[PDB]
Design a protein around this ligand. Sequence first.
Ligand code: NAD
Ligand code: NAD
Ligand code: MG
Ligand code: MG
Ligand code: ZN
Ligand code: ZN
Ligand code: ZN
Ligand code: ZN
Lengths: 408, 414
Amino acid sequence: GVITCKAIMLKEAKLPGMSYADTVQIIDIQVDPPQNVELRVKMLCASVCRTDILTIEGFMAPTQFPKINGHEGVGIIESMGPDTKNFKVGDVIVAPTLGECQTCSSCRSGRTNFCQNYGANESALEPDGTSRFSYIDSDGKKKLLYYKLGCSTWTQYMVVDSNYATKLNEIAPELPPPHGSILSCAFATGYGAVWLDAAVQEGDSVAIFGVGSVGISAVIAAKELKAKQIIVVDRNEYKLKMAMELGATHCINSEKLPEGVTPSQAVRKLTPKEVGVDASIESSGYDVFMNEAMKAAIHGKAKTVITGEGIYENDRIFFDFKDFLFGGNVVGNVTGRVRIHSDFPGLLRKAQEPVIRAGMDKILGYDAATMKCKYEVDIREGTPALLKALEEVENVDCVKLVIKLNDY
Amino acid sequence: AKPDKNGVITCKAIMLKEAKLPGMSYADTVQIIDIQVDPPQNVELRVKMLCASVCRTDILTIEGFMAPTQFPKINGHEGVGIIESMGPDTKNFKVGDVIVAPTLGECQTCSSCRSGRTNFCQNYGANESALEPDGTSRFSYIDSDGKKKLLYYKLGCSTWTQYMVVDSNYATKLNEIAPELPPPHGSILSCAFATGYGAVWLDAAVQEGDSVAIFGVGSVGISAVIAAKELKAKQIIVVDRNEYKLKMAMELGATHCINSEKLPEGVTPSQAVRKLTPKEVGVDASIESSGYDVFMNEAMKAAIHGKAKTVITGEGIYENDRIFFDFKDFLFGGNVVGNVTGRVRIHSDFPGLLRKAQEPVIRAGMDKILGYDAATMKCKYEVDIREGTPALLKALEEVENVDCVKLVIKLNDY
Ligand SMILES: NC(=O)c1ccc[n+]([C@@H]2O[C@H](COP(=O)([O-])OP(=O)(O)OC[C@H]3O[C@@H](n4cnc5c(N)ncnc54)[C@H](O)[C@@H]3O)[C@@H](O)[C@H]2O)c1
Ligand SMILES: NC(=O)c1ccc[n+]([C@@H]2O[C@H](COP(=O)([O-])OP(=O)(O)OC[C@H]3O[C@@H](n4cnc5c(N)ncnc54)[C@H](O)[C@@H]3O)[C@@H](O)[C@H]2O)c1
Ligand SMILES: [Mg+2]
Ligand SMILES: [Mg+2]
Ligand SMILES: [Zn+2]
Ligand SMILES: [Zn+2]
Ligand SMILES: [Zn+2]
Ligand SMILES: [Zn+2]
């Protein structure tokens, strides 16, 4: 029942000064059959979240190497543990970081996805300390591989606890793989941050700090929800122009501001009476933008939704104290607050509307005739092609790199 | 006091000459002096103050908090008084009304007011200039050289004065709902009590059966305990290093107490709080009322991820004017808000709070915070502006006494 397949292994953290070649390799791994309520999933593609690059740099993994990378991806159920309910072999699933038990006081509040019973699997292991992944090293020893959290997506086959899975095939049978892959993290996060957490209403103003794939998904949501004003802030003019094309109304290049004008000052100057924005979204990973987004919000009334991640000194972020006391309102957000049972089905339906699909196509640079994305690499084409693709994640026009894992 | 023929009142006020920086004394910067108080203009109230009461933010103001250029000033934002006169444009107030005038007004028409969920009014926000909008001040003094000099406010007014002037858009009346309320209770309703009570009642929206953590049980945190008890919280966990105020908190409804200076080896305040909750899930509502930057982060971490709100009331003079949060715990369900005056809106919420303050258990708790003696109308720690600068300097040092919860500054006969 053991599958042998290709996976992207991280040997150790890539610390500053080290290369991708030093730590990243495509290898053959062994994937054990699923136990209990687990799904073993034939992956179609992964797509590269900035958090995947932070993971390569050791984020949230002080001991959890070697590992198979990745949390953003989509695939098809190949087999299931004997206790599984509510899934079938052949279902198309995504498996984000947080499940939804629907019975804990967090689920029952109706206002959060931080489920007390199906929270983030920070151990990067099965609950017994084992892993469904292993490999045979050059010494010929069988060695354990850690997951990312509850699973790894940079692999032709993964195993995940079905309490974290949600299916695509009943609502969206024709959804292309790359779209399913960004729905598993990037698109849910940006869209949800605006729709659910900031709770943007028709006529609200929105500021979005960082228009990578997450920020652009937030623009798409703000436009869909008929925000009066959608302000985008970034150093990347290509991605600012893409945000404007998908509905942003005002753009600010933060690296072209005068030295004495902060990003929050620049945002506030666009709003009437310098009052700030109804909803402030941070989607950059830049600790400075977390404090700027907090400042750009209308004091008291508006919520600042922090989605960014990064490797911060002492794992700490900072806020300017006076501006925080006098009306700051900041929340941490994982996966857009999009609960896998209560919210994700509705987001999946929305994603199929033509303007939403067009925006996802633009994020991906998707060609529906060829099913190819602008920036794509196939796990079957070897380690050198992958290392080059990982470097090209920093290209100005690379919004979302796709890793193809199997035939579609 | 009686105005001169030009309407100017001469009275006592507590002047701050400059910031009391580290190593400086209260004697270096704090003096009771005679000041002139101009007549009110426009929609202003000129108010005969009954008493001020000492908020930790008053002491921060003495240390220069939020006042890089706004010295010399008259201190104080917590206090109560009686309208003596009004500007010609004033609406909805009478001479003789008893008022308090906190930092935020409530226009009722801006998008923040109409949200129903904040007190941060866009039209009547904090007056950080510590001046009138034209750059004048209603306060001046004659210095030792014989020259008339300007005095800054705290924000929109100063309370440490026998007579204050404030824009009536920041005032709310006590005498219709609570005519018998004593002055020091009115004073703590203007800041300390509203802040702790409102942080629990309005901002954290504590429900019957919720668990609550309160970091710092000074007057603000003890007011939070009183609210959490009134709202029938299941669990009220208080954290501090002052054993006297932890014990007062327990007497007024706290269920568990933690001494942050006596924790086991390897245990943070947030861990200590979570250890008292089922499966170490933390609390439904986390209140910070200490001014200790460490406790703002511990309060964030004690809250149930995602579900709970952490309400930050604390103030201080911090390294690089910033505070910090542990990033992984913050991203994975942190929820932190800045709170001024408990989110208690002066028109929409204050009347209800003033009615609650008259209920017997709530009044008993206010009496305990103040150490109030109804027979003498005197508080346990009280100093009178009419009795000289030396007595004031001693009282300011005695703010640090373990059993000083709320120092009252009497300003006028009651
Ligand atoms: N909370 C979650 O569930 C969640 C989900 C998705 C991604 N993330 C995090 O959210 C962030 C956004 O994800 P992404 O994949 O879109 O990342 P990304 O790297 O693709 O895009 C980030 C954008 O922010 C901009 N930015 C970063 N630093 C900047 C600076 N110094 N000046 C100006 N602009 C700056 C970049 O130019 C870029 O356009 C990342 O930090 C990622 O790790 C978190
Ligand atoms: N946001 C507002 O509207 C508002 C209103 C009132 C007060 N404040 C601020 O809120 C805080 C509470 O005000 P207060 O007048 O009750 O203050 P206070 O100083 O009388 O009481 C603070 C309490 O916190 C405890 N604390 C402080 N540092 C500590 C440490 N290192 N370890 C353990 N415990 C510690 C103290 O021992 C004390 O019991 C202050 O910072 C004050 O400046 C703000
Ligand atoms: Mg398992
Ligand atoms: Mg005025
Ligand atoms: Zn991600
Ligand atoms: Zn749950
Ligand atoms: Zn105060
Ligand atoms: Zn208003």
